[model samples]
Each structure stands twice: as structure tokens, then as C-alpha cells.
Target chain A: QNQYFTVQENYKERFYQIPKVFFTSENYKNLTNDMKIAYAILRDRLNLSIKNSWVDEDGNIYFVYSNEKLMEILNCKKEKLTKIKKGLENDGLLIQKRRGLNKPNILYLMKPIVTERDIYKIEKEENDVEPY
Target chain B: QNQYFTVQENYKERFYQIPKVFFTSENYKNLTNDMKIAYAILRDRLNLSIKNSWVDEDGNIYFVYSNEKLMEILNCKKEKLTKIKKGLENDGLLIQKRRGLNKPNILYLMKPIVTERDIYKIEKEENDVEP
Candidate 1:
């Protein structure tokens, strides 16, 4: 079929309504239908394979992050934080459209892995830093 | 404007254009103006601290990745890949949300850190794996 092939199939399409900085009250009002479709496709592709990193579109790049990985960067867990700049500019982030280095990126930082003990530790550390 | 606000009145804006999978042909046509503004704000916040990892938006979370961090997640590095799945659910990703395991997410996979020698290694390995 010329229309990208249409077939009957069953699939799961689930998206939660989480608070997004980008989707502030203003942006929420201005969200165009076009962006909605793109978001839909973006979700589809992400759900397709969590192992598959790098979504290279012709225009711009959107970077995805994992929780543990996010903590490593935020908390400086391994002192390997430079991975942010290095990955965005000089890495395998782009699969197509304008070779390496020349491309751009929009990074999305995922949350971190927190535990009860971790929270206590963090609070203790902060309290100590504040001083009397 | 009292605290570190009057130090500088000069300002400018800039951003990078990296090739990404999400900004596909059709999606590119659909990028909304609000998304662009939101993107600009997000970029500003991210540039403030490159070492920063996650950007929590009250209810949802935006996961940022470094090249090394990205590769680890995608390549199943160290067999710790489950980190990806659990990260989205039942974790500390939510700074403020309905609760644990209830927060929703839209992950953005950053690119890998490829090396010349590593490329050579990959090529050599692929050749061997082929019949």
C-alpha cells in the first residue's frame, strides 16, 4: 500500500501525566498538535528498545538518561561527569544527518536512585555542611 | 536584584544542533514553539551545571546522560542494564509526584562514546562474527 501500509494489530500505548519543566503552564497552553504527534512517535520509539541509545533525526538530537546513570553524573559518583559534554559533542550520539561533532543535542536528565539510607546520608551531609 | 543579580547585565543565548532519532522527519515538522521555548529553558538550566544529571519537573523527570553514561545504559555495560528499567519506575527519579512507582517518564537516549581503536576493534569483531 502507498499509505505507509496499514494493518490491524494490537499494541499497548501508555503514557503518564508527570510534571515536566518544559510543559509548564504556559507551554501546556501552547502545545501544538504537531508536537503531540512527534511526542507520540518519540514514546513509541523509546519503548521499542531501551537498549538502543541515540535517536538521530535530521534536525536535532534528544538524549535519554537512566536513573543510576543520572545519579553518577549528578552526585559525581565516579568522577566521570565529563561524559555530558563529551557525549553531546564528540561521541556516537548521532546515527545520521551531519556526521560527528557538527551535530547538536537536547539532553533530558532522568531521576536518580534514592534509598532511605541514602536520603538520611544526604541530609546528614547537608546539615554538616551548613554549620552551627 | 540583590544576590549575584547585578554582577552582570550582559547576556546571550546559544545551543547545539546534534542529529537525534526523536527529531525524525515528521516530528521535525511538528516541533511546537512552546517546545522550543521549553527546550531553551531546559538548556539554560542544564548548562548551569553540566555535571548535573536529572531535571525533575515536579510530576515528571527529564533524564540527562553523558556519552559514557549513555553508552553504559545502551550497551548493557557491566550487566547493570536493569538500571534503565528500574530508573523509570520504583526509584528516586521523582522529586515530587503521585508517589514512588507512579511517576511517568519519557527517556532521551544520548549517543555513545566511540573511539578509533574501538571502531577498529568493532570492525574486526564483526568480521569474525560473520560467516
Candidate 2:
């Protein structure tokens, strides 16, 4: 509990831009200037983890909620997931079961979204067999 | 070290049936009935995590690769997600940028999926649509 830190409301918007590099604690210290800046902005300024290891080997990042540390970071309960994972059906958490992977990993967790906010949100335009 | 895992000569088969679950220890006892059944079938069944906790409240789950503990349990690396996220131009890891009680959350970590995967994996048809 003591290891966890908290941030205020003003920090939310600013926090998203903070660069989080989820890796090991050791590598965390070895972060470069860019990563350091990202870290500072995210962790100290915006209140986010570098998330150095919350990704894959090829620099592919996934929010690895594999530990209690993640629990503290997200500010939610472990049991709370049960409601969303199964309740909303596909609207909840999305676990990826790909080839050459250990456990089917939790690649995505569907949080509540702001409908109106989606206005300008950049997205993929659906068009199958459309002539470009 | 050499635990137990193997991928076929051909990789990435939309093989969305492999099952996996975590939160285990040496003891491996006192698991819930749901947990046990999920573990067995999923482990042997479809390739997915009953992901018991991959979500939280309201049932928000994130993929947690805590230790080597989870490594051998499944096989994909911790990093394969980067390319898909960054490269796909938002087609990848869409970490949730929300504000509630905590810092910026990653409610979504997008992985490589099939075009059909998108079409078939349905629910919200859009525009106040019915399920």
C-alpha cells in the first residue's frame, strides 16, 4: 500500500501523454533522456508508471496486469473484473490467444467510454472491397 | 529456463482457442470451482484466458505477465505488442485514457486480429443498436 502513489483530477488529461516504459525496475533506472522525460512526465508529473515490462519483446506494449502492482496502479479491485469480463460479454476484457504464447494473455480491458467524446476520435474507416 | 511450450512451424493462426489462466503458486490449492474448471478446459481448450481478472470494475481486466510464472504458462513474449500498437497507427494497443480514481489506465491493449475476427466478434452493431 505504501508503495503506491496517488494523483489529482488535474493530472488525468496530462497523464495520458506521459511516456510509460513498462519494464523491470532495474531497466527503469537505465532509461534514456527521452524515456526519462517520458517517465518524469508520466510518473512524477502525470502519475503513471513507465510500464517498462507491460509489453512484449519487440517493443510491442500491452498493459500487463499480472501483479498486485497493476491493481494499485489502476486504483480498482481484482474482483471487479469479474463483472465486466463476463457481464458485458464482448464489451468487457479481451484476452488474446495467439500462437506460441503461454497463457492466453489479457491484451485488452474495456473500460467505460465517453460516447460524445468519440466525435473527433481518429479511427479506421470500414470499407471492404472498396476501390481505392 | 526450459519449462514447457512449443509453437508450430506456422505462427499467428488466429488460433483464438488456446486457453490460459494465471494467479498461481507452488501451492496451487484452494482454487474456486470456476477457477479450476476454467484452468483445466481453457488450458486444454480454446486459446484464451478465462482471464479471471483480466478486467476490473466494472470488471476491468489487464494482461498481467508478473513473473516467469506466467511466461511458461503461455508462450508469447511480453514485447510482441509494441509493433502492432505503434505501427498500426492506433490499430494497436488502445490503452484507455480515462480519469476516475487513478492515473491514466490501459483498459485496452490491442493485439493483431483478423478482418473476419472483427466482423464475427460482434455485439454493438452501432448507433444505439440492439444486441
Candidate 3:
């Protein structure tokens, strides 16, 4: 019976934020679903990056994510993870800088590029005031 | 050069929230990625539901979303949208009730069930104090 109750006000729930731009921007339309999700996961790591001060001298924020850890998170095998990473890199949404032997590659997550057309579309939608 | 700057403190960006439980809960492992995303999109409509007072006599909050609108949002065709809706219903994450005639179906979006195991796992992670 308690489970049947509708979610009330002030109910706290944790969520992973996936940028809306990833789906709406034409620049990112070519990215696969998995690639988009991978980017979201990488973006979620920014909090940890901030905590650990994982920033380069140029003040560019980066994070270190091992292949094994990512595989576990995504529940995918090495092959699939590799393919997703490649797809993200190809779409210019992720840049992986290799380190020396036995070191994990540094991952730099890029923000989605919002073109002028995307801005216009988003503005139009906002103006419509259709809540979705 | 401004574009090259790192995301600074208090940067505001709009995002759609996907419940983390969907990924961590073993019960939801069978759901497809598309299904999970669709759930997020539906969950996002709760605000509009509240605003519009789309509640039933029993106080169950529901929303109305037509197939055409969903197809536009997901950038998919009717076939794919139908399959996603069916999958959600199969998993008990969504319930669609027909309104009869030409009206759209009334949609009730369900919250993910958090199992005991999920609670224990979440508690353990929170207690790690790794931060």
C-alpha cells in the first residue's frame, strides 16, 4: 500500500544529469546512443575531478578513468567499450590522452557544441511554453 | 578563448535526469537503454502534471502524452515509439489507459522499485566515507 503512493513533494531522489543539448543539437545527432550515455557518465565524473584537483597546468579539467572501471560501470565487455570510446572520440565529444606504460589515459570531456540553429530551435521551444 | 575555459563554479546547464537506480538496480537490468531513457523523459513530465493538476479521483498523478509528440522527442518513427511504450508497460514502469474515441491515452508513470538489496548496496556505498 505504501508503495502505491504517488511521489509527494520534497521526495529526494538522486539522478544522473544528461545534458539536453546532446539530444537536441544537430552537431551531436551522429553520435550513437551508447556514445551519448558514455559522454554523460564521463560528464558525471566532473564532481570527482573537482574533488581530486585533477586539473592540468593549463587549468583544463580532466579525469582518469581506467578501461576496466568503465567496463564495469557500463556493463560491457572490452570490445564494446572500445567501440563506444572510439565513437565518442570520433564525434569530438571525448579526447583520451594516453599515458606511459601501466598508467590510465586521461579523459577530457567536451561540452556539446550548440550551433545557431540549435539556439534558435531551443529558444522557439522555450517560447512555446510547452512543458514536457 | 572563453570556450576553452573549464566549467567554473556555479555554471548553470539544463539537463534531463535519469534515475541512477535504473542502472544500479538488478531488477532493471533487463530494460533496454531506450526504455530507460523513455522513462526519464516521462518522469520529466511530472512537473507539468503537477502544474496542470492532472490527478485522478484517487489522487494518482498522471499525464497525457501522444505518440506523435513522443516520436518527435525521441527522433524515432511510430514503430520504434510503439515498441518503447510496450517495453515500458511490460516492465511495469509505465501504465497506459485508453480514453476511448480520439483522445490520447492517459499515462501513469511509475517510480522505480528500490529493493532491499538496492538499499543495502546504496547504504554500503554511502558509508564508505571515501570522500
Question: Scored by CA lDDT, what does every candidate get?
Answer: 0.31, 0.35, 0.71
Q: Kindly list the per-residue Cα lDDT of model 2 for residues B19-117, writing each as its tens digit.
A: 111222211222223333323332332223233455556644454333243334434344533332232223232344445553433434333334443
Instruction: Kindly give the stretch of ten consecutive residues in candidate 2 chain B with the minimal lDDT sum.
Output: B18-27
lDDT of 2 by residue, A98-130 (tens): 434434334432222333223222222222356
Candidate 1 has an lDDT of: 0.31
- Best-fitting candidate, scored by TM-score: 3
- The TM-score measured for candidate 2 stands at 0.22
* Model 3 steric clash pairs: none
lDDT (Cα, tens digit) per residue for candidate 3, span A14-52:
566776666677777787777767677667667667667
Best by lDDT: 3
Q: Give RMSD to native, each candidate.
A: 22.0, 24.8, 4.9
Candidates sorted by TM-score, best first:
3, 2, 1
| Residue-wise C-alpha lDDT for candidate 1, range B1-131, written one tens digit per residue | 35553211111011212222113223233433233322333333343232343445553334433334433323335334334334323322212223235343334322222334434433342232112
How far in Å is the alpha carbon of B41 misplaced in model 3?
1.7
- Estimate the TM-score of every prediction: 0.19, 0.22, 0.80
Q: Model 2's lDDT to the true fold?
A: 0.35
Candidate 3 stretches greater than 4 Å from native? A1-12, A126-132, B1-12, B50-53, B57-60, B122-131
